[PDB]
């Protein structure tokens, strides 16, 4: 299923002469969603287990500027450069932009210096700040939850963030 | 079903085993181990076809059962254990010590050797890994990992390695004039000095090796085993001393006897 059964670039039918060799395995997609955590183990090749997350929430999210990370419930999926169907179904994949319950980062900031190891000097964006004010912040996912079994991700920043906002843009 | 192959057919056996076409259908199939089957040799062959201590596989097995044959000083009861290029065999009852070497043909001889020199073995490093705690480990052609190797050891050079204890004695860099043995194509037994190394960019680094008849021959760097500094070898070489004669010369030599 990872295999041939496909035209030959010249557009000639490869007359098949070989079954399907198990090492051409194409086991089917875990459309991993939001919800309470729930993950199965699929047994890949040499007992190499991999963790089909099927529901998720509490991924590890990073804040790249400051280069730190925190575990947060993720409250909604809002964009998917693959397809809008996935976002409709609220399915987490390796480049989904999603919304983090983003109090943790704020709390961390407060603990460290001010209110909304240390190479601080950068001191936050405007857009990001605004986002924080509502509690909830946009962030890519970066793990492939379907393989790794974790919704690990990172906060979307400056230029990329702007681009994603534009993409989202509402309007009509 | 289809997985790995357990058997070896006696014609498909690598020539320098020197098996028969008759005298069997199969060959021994070296166990996985510290050597590459095409450049190893199982213990069975050693016991039966080289030393001729055994007539049969059965006899070899029996011998092994008495825990009396050591290869690199720790015992082996696996009949088809691969012995390979440099390894000292200590048959305990005779108090014989062999070291495997190459002939001037491709063939393994067991060399015969002293107690004193037996205690070490040469080992060429292949890879030099960094591992946890920034500690470097060399990996020898003996499929053996030497940890905490002396920093000046580089990827191709040989290492005089003790057997009683896992630690190393000394190392011999892969220099422009370093006494070398070969271990692959055509010039296999050959022993030379090295003239020159090519150091090709994407490819195999070919090297040229002047003999003691001053006959230059080239070889891949892959399959060259450093054995000395220009003066003296750090091991006892066989009687021929790696001097692959011409065919005519060889014939003449044969005649004069």
């Amino acid at each position: 299923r990872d295999g041939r059964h496909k035209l030959r670039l010249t557009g000639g039918k490869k007359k098949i002469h070989k079954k399907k060799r198990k090492y051409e395995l194409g086991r089917p997609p875990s459309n991993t969603k939001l919800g309470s955590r729930q993950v199965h183990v699929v047994r890949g090749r040499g007992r190499n287990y991999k963790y089909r997350a099927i529901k998720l929430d509490s991924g590890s999210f990073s804040w790249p500027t400051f280069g730190i990370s925190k575990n947060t419930r993720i409250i909604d999926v809002v964009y998917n450069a693959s397809n809008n169907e996935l976002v409709r179904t609220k399915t987490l994949v390796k480049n989904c932009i999603v919304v983090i319950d983003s109090h943790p980062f704020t709390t961390w900031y407060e603990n460290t210096f001010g209110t909304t190891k240390i190479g601080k000097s950068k001191n936050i964006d405007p857009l990001l700040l605004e986002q924080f004010k509502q509690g909830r912040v946009l962030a890519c996912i970066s793990s492939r939850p379907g393989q790794c079994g974790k919704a690990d991700g990172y906060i979307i920043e400056g230029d990329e963030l702007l681009f994603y906002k534009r993409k989202m843009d509402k309007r009509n | 079903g289809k997985g790995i192959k357990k058997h070896l057919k006696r014609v498909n056996a690598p020539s320098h085993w020197m098996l028969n076409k008759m005298g069997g259908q199969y060959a021994p199939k070296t166990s996985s181990g510290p050597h590459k089957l095409l450049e190893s040799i199982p213990l069975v062959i050693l016991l039966r076809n080289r030393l001729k201590y055994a007539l049969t596989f059965d006899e070899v097995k029996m011998i092994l059962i008495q825990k009396i044959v050591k290869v690199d000083n720790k015992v082996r009861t696996d009949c088809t254990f691969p012995v390979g290029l440099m390894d000292v065999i200590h048959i305990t009852k005779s108090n014989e010590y062999f070291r495997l070497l190459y002939d001037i043909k491709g063939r393994f001889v067991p060399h015969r050797i002293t107690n004193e020199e037996s205690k070490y073995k040469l080992c060429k490093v292949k890879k030099i890994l960094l591992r946890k705690g920034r500690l470097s480990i060399a990996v020898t052609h003996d499929g053996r990992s030497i940890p905490y190797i002396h920093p000046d050891v580089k990827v191709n050079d040989t290492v005089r390695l003790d057997l009683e204890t896992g630690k190393v004695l000394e190392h011999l860099k892969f220099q422009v004039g370093s006494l070398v043995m070969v271990t692959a194509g055509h010039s296999v037994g050959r022993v030379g000095v090295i003239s020159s190394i090519d150091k090709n960019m994407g490819t195999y680094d070919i090297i040229h090796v002047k003999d003691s008849r001053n006959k230059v021959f080239a070889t891949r760097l892959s399959n060259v085993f450093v054995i000395g500094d220009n003066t003296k070898p750090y091991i006892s070489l066989p009687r021929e001393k790696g001097i692959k004669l011409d065919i005519i010369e060889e014939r003449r030599n044969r005649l004069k006897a």
Partner: protein, 146 residues
Amino acid sequence: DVQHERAYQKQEGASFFNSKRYWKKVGLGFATPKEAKEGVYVDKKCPFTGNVSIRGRILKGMVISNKMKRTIIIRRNYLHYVKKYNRFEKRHKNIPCHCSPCFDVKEGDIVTVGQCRPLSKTVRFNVLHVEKHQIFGSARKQFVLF
């Protein structure tokens, strides 16, 4: 316009926030062009800018097409000896290569391509160095022994 896709075209291996844009050397004496080091453009499968290491064969060709996006075709023209007639005969083979927009390549231009991993159904190569060259018929028809 750099960001043309539905996704943000980033450049993996960049490192934006901390540290003292990303390109690499690719080796075998193929000089990374100015357009890779300068000149923003994101390419996952650029030899220099992206994450594909060229390794294996290097073979010169001559471009037939630019029609695909960031992807080129190169016919290798060569001579298959036939022992019966102790003569040769022109033969050929169209290698598809990935380009990367550091190289502006019109047709008939000589290129050299390194191997690299399977980038798509057929493109296993990418162009490392583009000699200029000029052509008058169709590149299709130019034999250049090489």
